[PDB]
Amino acid sequence: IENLPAFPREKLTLRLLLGSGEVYEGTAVDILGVGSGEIKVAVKTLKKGSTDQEKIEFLKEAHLMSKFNHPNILKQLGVCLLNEPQYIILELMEGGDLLTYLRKARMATFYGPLLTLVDLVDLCVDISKGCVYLERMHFIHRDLAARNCLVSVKDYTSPRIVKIGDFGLARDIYLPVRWMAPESLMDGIFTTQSDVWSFGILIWEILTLGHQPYPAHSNLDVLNYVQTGGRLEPPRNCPDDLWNLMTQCWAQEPDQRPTFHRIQDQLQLFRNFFLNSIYKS
Numbered sequence: 001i002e003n004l005p006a007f008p009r010e011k012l013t014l015r016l017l018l019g020s021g022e023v024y025e026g027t028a029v030d031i032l033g034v035g036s037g038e039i040k041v042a043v044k045t046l047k048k049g050s051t052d053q054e055k056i057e058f059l060k061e062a063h064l065m066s067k068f069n070h071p072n073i074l075k076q077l078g079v080c081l082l083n084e085p086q087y088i089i090l091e092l093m094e095g096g097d098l099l100t101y102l103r104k105a106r107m108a109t110f111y112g113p114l115l116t117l118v119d120l121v122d123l124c125v126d127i128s129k130g131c132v133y134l135e136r137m138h139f140i141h142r143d144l145a146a147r148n149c150l151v152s153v154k155d156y157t158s159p160r161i162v163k164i165g166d167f168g169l170a171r172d173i174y175l176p177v178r179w180m181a182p183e184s185l186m187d188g189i190f191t192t193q194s195d196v197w198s199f200g201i202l203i204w205e206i207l208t209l210g211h212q213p214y215p216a217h218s219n220l221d222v223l224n225y226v227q228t229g230g231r232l233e234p235p236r237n238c239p240d241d242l243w244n245l246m247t248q249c250w251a252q253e254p255d256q257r258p259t260f261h262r263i264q265d266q267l268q269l270f271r272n273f274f275l276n277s278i279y280k281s
C-alpha cells in the first residue's frame, strides 16, 4: 500500500519565495532523522483555487517520485496534503535549475566560464546515471532538459551534484519541440529511445553552457530542419568523442540510438581518457 511521506505542517516553516505552482525555500524540523534539526528544504505548493486536473497532476507527481531512490534523482522528503495549499517537500538544491546554473557560469567573466570541461563532463555523467536508474525502473521521462535538472550548490567552487528534478510528464512503461525526437513530433510516440534523443540535446546544453538549441530556427521551422536530417552544430571546441556520442543519440532511427548503459559507459571512458591525458603531459 503506497504511502506518501506525511510531514507535520507545523514542523514545516516557509520563508523565501523562489518562483512560479509556487516554490518556497524553507526549513523542516527533523525530516532527516530525530536529531535532524531544522534542515533546509524547497516547497512546491498546489494552488488554493486551481483546476482539479492540476490537483490530479499534483498528486500523480507526488506519487511518482515516492517511488525513486537514487543519488541523481531529486528527493521528495515530505508532503502536506490534508490541508490546502498542499505542500510537496523537496530537498533543497541551492544552485537552482541546471540551465540557469550553466548560463551564469558562462556569463560571469570573459576571463572565461566558471565551469571547465571536466566539471561539464561530471554533470553529464551524473544525469546519465539517473537515466539508467529511471530506465531500470521502467519509467520514461519525456522531458529531459537542463531546465528540469537541479544543482546542489550555488557556487562554482564547491563539490556539486546534479539531479533530474521535475517529473511532470514522466510515465511508467512497464514547446518543447527543440528537445523532442522526430517520432514524438510527428506521431506523438514516446519511448526510452526518445529519452536518449532528448538526453543528447541535454548534454549539448551542458557543453554549450545553456545555449538555445537550433538558434537559427523558429519553433515552426525546427521540425522542418530536423526533417531535413539537419541537427545541432557542435558546441565550440567540443571533444570529438563527445560529439560522436551526441550525434549517435540523435540517429533519425530509434534503434540505432545507444542505450543509457552505453551512454554512461561512453562518458566515464572519455572522462578516464581525458584525465589520463592531462596527467601524462
Ligand SMILES: C[C@@H](Oc1cc(-c2cnn(C3CCNCC3)c2)cnc1N)c1c(Cl)ccc(F)c1Cl
Residues within 6 Å of the ligand: 018, 019, 023, 042, 044, 074, 090, 091, 092, 093, 094, 095, 096, 097, 100, 147, 148, 149, 150, 164, 165, 166
Ligand atoms: C520544484 C522546484 O524545486 C526546487 C527549486 C530550487 C530553486 C532555487 N532557485 N530557483 C530559481 C530561482 C529563480 N531563477 C530560477 C531558479 C529554483 C531549488 N531546489 C528545488 N528542489 C524546481 C524548479 Cl523551480 C525548477 C526545476 C526543477 F526540476 C524543480 Cl524540481
